[PDB]
Design a protein around this ligand. Sequence first.
Ligand SMILES: *C(=N)C1(NC(=O)[C@@H]2C[C@@H](S(O)(O)c3ccc(OC)cc3Cl)CN2C(=O)C2(c3ccc(Cl)cn3)CNC2)CC1
Length: 219
Amino acid sequence: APRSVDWREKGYVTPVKNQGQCGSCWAFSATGALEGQMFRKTGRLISLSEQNLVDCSGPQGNEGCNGGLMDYAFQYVQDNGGLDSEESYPYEATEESCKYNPKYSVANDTGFVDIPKQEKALMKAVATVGPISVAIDAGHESFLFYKEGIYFEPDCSSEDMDHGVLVVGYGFESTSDNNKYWLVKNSWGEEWGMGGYVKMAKDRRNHCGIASAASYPTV
Ligand SMILES: *C(=N)C1(NC(=O)[C@@H]2C[C@@H](S(O)(O)c3ccc(OC)cc3Cl)CN2C(=O)C2(c3ccc(Cl)cn3)CNC2)CC1
């Protein structure tokens, strides 16, 4: 694998979005990963509808603004035979009746891959696939108020994750002793972290569980 990867540079990643007060992180993580895979397939970067996922993926196990799983989202897209664009089905930050319209479907998937639960495996996937959906322990105030640099939280759990985000690359700071990171796109808007991104500690015993529940859709 390369020493550093950043899929934003290659056109795989849409601008940072903002889930608001709805517990829809899982939907943003899932659209992120699917946006990347669709871009690889077609060469077209098209923002996808989180609202479509929030409103419609109940049968697959998702619970709207009260939480969900990226894999349940990928299963929905496969079951449903499509997913609408952001433009056609805009984000409301509240759970509403399903308004899926197949005329405006711009993405599909044929299942998903769960990555082995090691950072080495995660690195190989990011290098070869594109952006990857991941679960992290975001349940510390240090994360909420993160601004810049490599995020390390001594109390982070590698087993107990509560927030779905998107790994878009990895790399290292040229500064000192702990300098590797995962480049992670959050869904809390551009004013959180580094333009909506966080550089998370990499190769430090699966910090915050970043490799514990990593997956992406097949297209
Ligand atoms: C996001 N705004 C928020 N968090 C979730 O919905 C969160 C997303 C996933 S992950 O990424 O936390 C996750 C945790 C564990 C595992 O496998 C062990 C995989 C994943 Cl992807 C799940 N989330 C949850 O909050 C839970 C959940 C799961 C499933 C459903 Cl239908 C509802 N909630 C609660 N325990 C996992 C804050 C809402």
